[PDB]
Design a binder for this molecule. Structure first.
Ligand SMILES: Cc1oc2ncn(CCCN(C)C)c(=N)c2c1C
Ligand SMILES: Cc1oc2ncn(CCCN(C)C)c(=N)c2c1C
Length: 330
């Protein structure tokens, strides 16, 4: 089997991406944030504290003839950005782009933190990291991809995120028309539960490439690119007036700037992030200070190849017995 679903930016700045997902019988379609940095499929629901729901579409398990309460199971997750959610668990039929998994754990939120409530465009998350990170207790549950894997034509999924435009998540096949040149594959460590790999270096604009190992994770659920302070300083030094602002919470730059590109290495291959991808717009409405899309990972504890990086590539998440990651230009 295969599946193919369109993923769409939530706003004009690509602050996150949503993909429609069918849950239950009859189908209830929710727009979920596909997140290769976590491993829980959780949704706003009829059980979510009413004051914490503001415009999201909810899953109502009592209206699904295939929903079953997973007795005694609870979940609770805290994300790197400080957000969180928790609740109980159903199993139900979940379909993405024509690919159906029966008996998928659907984690129903009883509580969500303010940033979730405040984002009316995202009805939940669909985790695509390794199932070892799944938070369901006392019996850990599998991700949608892990459940689908055996049925897929090939044990892979691909992320093809757009810049200020829709893109695609495919399951079970590699669309050879969706990228240019060749896909370069690189080793993955699953030791921390992530799609963790090592970039071979970087360049800023038309500058020379610096060969240096940068360990990080391919994370579709993180918006920005988080790299070591040395790398990030080298990038922003090429932008007149750019500065790190403690009060704003990262590098900002004059909105009048034309940003340089940023290149990262995948083995001997190179992925180029155009400068415009690194502009996240005014820090507040009407401001002439703009927020940068490349930020320091110092104090995160890990480097994160988030959407800013991934959207410049066609990315293969190869879930074979020894997982690997592939990157192509597009
Ligand atoms: C205006 C805005 O800026 C954002 N940045 C990251 N995200 C992603 C947050 C992911 N986290 C909850 C685990 C957003 N959802 C978002 C919105 C909305
Ligand atoms: C993830 C993220 O964090 C931010 N902080 C400040 N601003 C401003 C942002 N636009 C932003 C985004 C996007």
């Amino acid at each position: 089997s295969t599946g193919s679903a369109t993923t769409t930016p939530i706003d004009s700045l690509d602050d996150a991406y949503i993909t429609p997902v069918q849950i239950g019988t009859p189908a209830q379609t929710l727009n979920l944030d596909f997140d290769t940095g976590s491993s829980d499929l959780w949704v706003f629901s009829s059980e979510t504290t009413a004051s914490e729901v503001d415009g999201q579409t909810i899953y109502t398990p009592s209206k699904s003839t295939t929903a079953k309460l997973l007795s005694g199971a609870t979940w609770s997750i805290s994300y790197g950005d400080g957000s969180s959610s928790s609740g109980d668990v159903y199993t139900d039929t979940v379909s993405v782009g024509g690919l159906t998994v029966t008996g998928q754990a659907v984690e129903s939120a009883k509580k969500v933190s303010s940033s979730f409530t405040e984002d009316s465009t995202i009805d939940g998350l669909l985790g695509l990291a390794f199932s070892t990170l799944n938070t369901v207790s006392p019996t850990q549950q599998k991700t949608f991809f892990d459940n689908a894997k055996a049925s897929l034509d090939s044990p892979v999924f691909t992320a093809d995120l757009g810049y200020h435009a829709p893109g695609t998540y495919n399951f079970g096949f590699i669309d050879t028309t969706a990228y240019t040149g060749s896909i370069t594959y690189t080793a993955v460590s699953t030791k921390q539960g992530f799609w963790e790999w090592t970039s071979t270096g970087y360049a800023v604009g038309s500058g020379t490439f610096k060969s240096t190992s940068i360990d990080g994770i391919a994370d579709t659920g993180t918006t920005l690119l988080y790299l070591p302070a040395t790398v990030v300083s080298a990038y922003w030094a090429q932008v007149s007036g750019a500065k790190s602002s403690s009060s704003v919470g990262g590098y900002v730059f004059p909105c009048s700037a034309t940003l340089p590109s940023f290149t990262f290495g995948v083995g001997s291959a190179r992925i180029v992030i155009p400068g415009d991808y690194i502009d996240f717009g005014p820090i507040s409405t009407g401001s002439s200070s703009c927020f940068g899309g490349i930020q320091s990972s110092a104090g995160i504890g890990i480097n994160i190849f988030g959407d800013v990086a991934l959207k410049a590539a066609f990315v293969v998440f190869n879930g074979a017995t020894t997982p690997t990651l592939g990157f192509a230009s597009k």
